[PDB]
């Protein structure tokens, strides 16, 4: 029956499909249409049309595997999209209409109904499938009777009767928050509209409002921009994605119901965009350190995942007004235009999203200016993101502590992310494809960049752990300078190391001390493991002399520097060792398959060439110290290292500090409360992390106590000399 409920469903259809906006003369839209035409064609030709069939699609036949239910229903949603698209060859097709109706009834009688119980993954029974069913019925509401709609959505009410919890029919339900809570809306708000149930709509929207509250503990968005999910996992880039992507779709509909959400409540979304998401986007790529186990999905590499966030932001801009709308448009526009590697349209899956992006990109009134430098210390999730606009590089520091899990391996995904938070670092430079094109299945998991580990064999069946210490954190001085430390102990408590980082505008110093090993395994720090481009080969220099790397590891004793020279200076990487160090390097082709790190992925062999740099630690009390200097040419790098000749202030078991004389900035990490005199100019007095700048006779102080997660009055931690 056509009423206010169907009106809302019409709006929903315009959002999840947007057939009303389709234009055959629009190349990008025609491309998506062609993709849907092909998917429906394949589904129609491979579907079982035999009496007493045991499945609809042979490749999604084992229904004890919950994933097969969602995949099946999604094929029907695709049919619904095309049967209602005037330009599709399947528009109002009698066979497709009957195929959707008959398939819904078949699955309802033999696979998914109220008399069934969760078998496999609860997510498919409560989120994946219900969403696919809601969308199918919404799109084809003019072909189904209200009784049929209520009949096919009864199963949804059986598995998801409570808008505040998931796994309600199990022996361990949980409180819905974040991304999951948003999906709760895409399940019950739409189901409510389809069933014309006001109580379901109102109660669900009320539950959804919890999402706008910032938290100071547990799962959710924090004031400092961090986002935690799954109890204690940094997750802005995966579950946070689902949250903004799904919520931006729902809001236009929710705001037109009899239960619209207060404007002041939704105000926090802008905080998420500017504080949480924006910093994690560099040249169109969403930083992997925020994506949890999703890094192990071949169809979701960094640039693809970023689009989930960007399309969400764009929709929010569209529903905003004035300056707010204008600036959000500019944010999306500059990020998209800075991405010369990935075509944003490859992940805009509805006509309205495509249309919005096209108008934005062609609107001269919307400014597209390169983003400025920034540095975000996401202490509540132990990650740090840095971006230098002058030189054009981004830097990500991935840590964990007693407050956070190191890596997530679940649902057979991310089987080898063991060391992705053991002080792993990311460098975002001119090669926008670096962490893409098969990086994850080919990178050697035992040598993640920046990590100090023993060479012990690790099991794919292992799961994450928290760190014994709470002494992990970042002290930020300004948009270009910060200092971080991690009181590191490895997975089996056989190795320790005081690892610290000194972000000094256009370079990052890496210092490690107190390196100890009680095992029979060899210990070493991976200085880098960089994925190469066959098109842009690097010329390697050691102590400014060209070196020829081989698949076989070569030792370079008394190394003062290593320089990776590209034809594009924006891809150059230099490493300056404060004190001559003994390192080893190799360049080799590494093969692997996505299935190796994610059971549900393809076993197809992938291969990439990597340049690995390592420093062995054969004695207790060992240390390492070097400066990473990106994006400068060879002559400039050589000049800079001479300027940094005496930049290392100290690197021992209680004090680590680097000084940038050009800036007049000091980075300092203290592991005890002894009085530390620095550069015969001032003293720092407390265990913690510091970033200090001298501006003649004045001193700006940034102190952070990572264990208590508090700063402190200047006189408690700093004292100028004389
Ligand atoms: C955040 C996350 O990893 N969520 C998991 C699901 O993944 C998301 O799926 C969708 C969607 O619209 O369904 C959008 C996102 O890009 C993607 O991250 C999914 O993996 C389900 C079920 O698993 S599966 O059978 O392995 O595919 O589990 C969620 O936790």
Question: Going by C-beta distance under 8 Å and a sequence separation of 6 or more, which residues neighbour residue 358?
Answer: 26, 28
Nearest partner of 186 among 241, 268, 251, 256, judged by Cα: 251
User: In 10 A of CB 534, how many CB atoms?
Assistant: 7
Rounded distance between C-alpha atoms, residue 542 and residue 405, angstroms: 37
Whether 318 contacts 356, CB under 8 Å: yes
Burial 221-238 (b: 16+ CB within 10 A, else e): bbebbbbbbbebbbbbbb
Quick check: helix, strand or coil at residue 617? Answer: coil
Whether 91 contacts 83, CB under 8 Å: yes
Burial 204-218 (b: 16+ CB within 10 A, else e): bbebbeebbeebeee
**If residue 488 lies in a helix (H) or strand (E), which one and from where to where?**
strand 481-489
Whether 483 contacts 669, CB under 8 Å: yes
Helices (H) and strands (E) in the chain, counts: 19, 31
User: 472: which strand partners?
Assistant: 486
For ligand 1, pick from 71, 242, 412 the residue to mutate: most ligand atoms within 8 Å of CB.
242
Nearest partner of 414 among 466, 456, 461, 467, judged by Cα: 461
Residue pointed to by tokens 């001269």: 364
Nearest partner of 420 among 604, 572, 605, 296, judged by Cα: 296
Quick check: helix, strand or coil at residue 626? Answer: strand
Of ligand 1's atoms, which has the minimum distance to the CA of residue 121? 22
Helix 146-159 / helix 129-139 crossing angle, nearest 10 deg: 170
Quick check: helix, strand or coil at residue 76? Answer: helix
Q: Which residue has a Cα nearest atom 4 of ligand 1?
A: 239
Resolution (A): 1.6
Question: Going by C-beta distance under 8 Å and a sequence separation of 6 or more, which residues neighbour residue 3?
Answer: 196
Rounded distance between C-alpha atoms, residue 575 and residue 585, angstroms: 13
Rounded distance between C-alpha atoms, residue 472 and residue 564, angstroms: 31
Classify residue 59 by its DSSP letter.
G
Rounded distance between C-alpha atoms, residue 70 and residue 72, angstroms: 5
Nearest partner of 549 among 613, 599, 499, judged by Cα: 613
* Domain residue spans of the chain: 1-373, 379-635, 636-721
* Percent of the chain that is helix, strand, coil (3-state, to 5): 35, 25, 40
Rounded distance between C-alpha atoms, residue 434 and residue 568, angstroms: 15
CATH for the stretch 379-635: 2.70.98.10
Rounded distance between C-alpha atoms, residue 52 and residue 71, angstroms: 21
Nearest partner of 256 among 2, 9, 1, judged by Cα: 9
User: 523: which strand partners?
Assistant: 454
CA angle 246, 239, 378 (to 5 degrees): 120
Ligand 1: centre distance to CA 47 (Å) = 25
User: 38: which strand partners?
Assistant: none
Ligand 1: centre distance to CA 412 (Å) = 13
Rounded distance between C-alpha atoms, residue 67 and residue 319, angstroms: 34
Rounded distance between C-alpha atoms, residue 216 and residue 379, angstroms: 12
Sequential DSSP letters for 181-235: HHHHHHHHHHHHHHTT-HHHHHHHHHHHGGGG---SSSSEE-TTS-EEETTTEE-
**If residue 354 lies in a helix (H) or strand (E), which one and from where to where?**
helix 351-362
Question: Going by C-beta distance under 8 Å and a sequence separation of 6 or more, which residues neighbour residue 188?
Answer: 156, 160, 163, 200, 201, 204
- What method did the depositors use to determine the structure? X-ray
Of ligand 1's atoms, which has the minimum distance to the CA of residue 246? 12
Ligand 1 binding residues, C-beta < 6 A: 67, 121, 123, 128, 179, 238-239, 242, 294, 308, 411, 600
Rounded distance between C-alpha atoms, residue 233 and residue 240, angstroms: 11
Nearest partner of 103 among 59, 139, 137, judged by Cα: 137
Rounded distance between C-alpha atoms, residue 89 and residue 565, angstroms: 53
User: 704: which strand partners?
Assistant: 689
Nearest partner of 312 among 373, 236, 256, judged by Cα: 236
Rounded distance between C-alpha atoms, residue 95 and residue 76, angstroms: 13
Please identify, in words, the CATH class of the domain defined by 1-373: mainly alpha
Phi, psi of 481 (to 5 degrees): -130, 130
Ligand 1: centre distance to CA 463 (Å) = 19
Whether 340 contacts 429, CB under 8 Å: no
Rounded distance between C-alpha atoms, residue 485 and residue 524, angstroms: 18
Burial 419-456 (b: 16+ CB within 10 A, else e): bbbbbbbbbbbbbbbbbbebbbbbbebbbbbbbbbbeb
CATH for the stretch 636-721: 2.60.220.10
Ligand 1: centre distance to CA 128 (Å) = 8
Whether 707 contacts 471, CB under 8 Å: yes
**If residue 46 lies in a helix (H) or strand (E), which one and from where to where?**
helix 27-46
Quick check: helix, strand or coil at residue 177? Answer: coil
Q: Which two tokens stand for residue 80?
A: 């619904």
């Amino acid at each position: 029956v056509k009423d206010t409920y169907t009106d809302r469903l019409d709006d929903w259809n315009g959002i999840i499909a947007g057939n009303q906006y389709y234009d055959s003369k629009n190349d990008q839209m025609a491309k998506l249409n062609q993709e849907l035409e092909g998917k429906v064609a394949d589904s129609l030709s491979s579907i079982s049309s035999q009496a007493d069939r045991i499945y609809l699609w042979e490749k999604f036949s084992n229904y004890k595997t919950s994933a097969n239910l969602t995949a099946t229903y999604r094929k029907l949603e695709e049919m619904a999209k095309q049967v209602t698209n005037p330009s599709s060859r399947y528009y109002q097709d009698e066979t497709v209409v009957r195929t959707v109706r008959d398939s819904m009834e078949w699955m309802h009688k033999h696979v998914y109904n109220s008399e069934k119980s969760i078998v496999g993954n609860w997510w498919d029974y409560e989120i994946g499938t219900p969403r696919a069913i809601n969308n199918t019925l919404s799109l084809m509401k003019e072909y189904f009777s209200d009784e049929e709609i209520k009949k096919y959505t009864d199963v949804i009410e059986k598995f998801v009767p409570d808008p505040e919890h998931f796994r309600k029919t199990t022996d361990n339900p949980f409180k819905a928050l974040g991304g999951n809570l948003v999906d709760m809306g895409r399940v019950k708000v739409i189901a409510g509209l389809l069933r014309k149930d006001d109580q379901e709509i109102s109660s669900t929207i009320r539950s959804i409002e919890q999402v706008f509250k910032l938290v100071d503990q547990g799962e959710g968005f924090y004031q400092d921009g961090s986002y935690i999910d799954h109890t204690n996992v940094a997750y802005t880039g995966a579950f946070g994605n689902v949250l903004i992507d799904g919520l931006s779709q729902l809001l236009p509909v929710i705001q037109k119901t009899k239960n619209p959400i207060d404007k002041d409540k939704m105000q926090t979304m802008y905080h998420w965009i500017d504080k949480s998401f924006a910093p994690l986007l560099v040249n169109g790529e969403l930083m992997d350190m925020s994506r949890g186990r999703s890094i192990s999905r071949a169809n979701s590499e960094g640039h693809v995942a970023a689009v989930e966030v960007l399309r969400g932001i764009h929709r929010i801009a569209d529903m905003s007004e004035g300056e707010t709308k204008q600036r959000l448009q500019s944010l999306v526009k500059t990020i998209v235009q800075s991405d010369s590697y990935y075509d944003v349209f490859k992940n805009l899956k509805t006509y309205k999203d495509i249309s919005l992006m096209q108008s934005l990109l062609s609107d001269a009134g919307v400014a597209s200016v390169p983003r400025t430098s920034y540095l975000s210390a996401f202490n509540k999730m132990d990650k740090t993101a840095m971006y230098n606009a002058e030189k054009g590089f981004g830097f990500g520091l991935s840590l964990f502590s007693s407050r956070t899990l190191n890596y997530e391996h679940m649902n057979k995904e991310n089987k080898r992310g063991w060391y992705t938070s053991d002080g792993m670092f990311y460098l975002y430079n001119g090669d926008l494809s670096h962490y893409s094109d098969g990086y994850w299945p080919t990178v050697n998991p035992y040598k993640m960049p920046g990590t100090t580990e023993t060479d012990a064999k690790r099991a794919d069946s292992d799961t994450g752990k928290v760190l014994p210490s709470a002494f992990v954190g970042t002290s930020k001085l300004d948009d270009a300078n910060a200092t971080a430390t991690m009181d590191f102990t490895n997975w089996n408590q056989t190795l320790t190391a005081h690892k610290s980082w000194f972000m000094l505008k256009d370079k990052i110093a890496f210092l490690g001390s107190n390196i100890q090993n009680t095992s029979t395994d060899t210990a070493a720090t991976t200085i880098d493991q960089r994925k190469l481009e066959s098109s842009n080969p690097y010329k390697v220099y050691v102590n400014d002399k060209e070196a020829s790397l081989t698949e076989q590891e070569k030792d370079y004793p008394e190394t003062q520097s290593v320089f990776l020279e590209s034809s594009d200076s924006k891809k150059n990487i230099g490493y300056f060792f404060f004190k001559k160090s003994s390192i080893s390097m190799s360049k080799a082709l590494q093969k692997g398959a996505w299935k190796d790190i994610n059971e549900g992925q393809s076993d197809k062999e992938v291969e990439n060439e990597f340049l690995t740099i390592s420093q062995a630690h054969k004695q207790n009390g060992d240390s390492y110290g070097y400066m990473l200097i990106p994006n400068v040419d060879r002559a400039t790098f050589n000049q800079m290292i001479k300027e940094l000749e005496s930049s290392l202030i100290e690197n021992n078991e209680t004090l680590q500090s680097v000084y940038d004389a050009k800036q007049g900035v000091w980075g300092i990490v203290k592991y005890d409360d002894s009085v530390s005199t620095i550069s015969n100019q001032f003293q720092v007095l407390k265990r913690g992390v510091y970033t200090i700048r001298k501006e003649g006779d004045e001193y700006k102080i940034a102190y952070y106590n990572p264990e208590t997660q508090e700063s402190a009055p200047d006189q408690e931690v700093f004292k100028k000399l004389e």
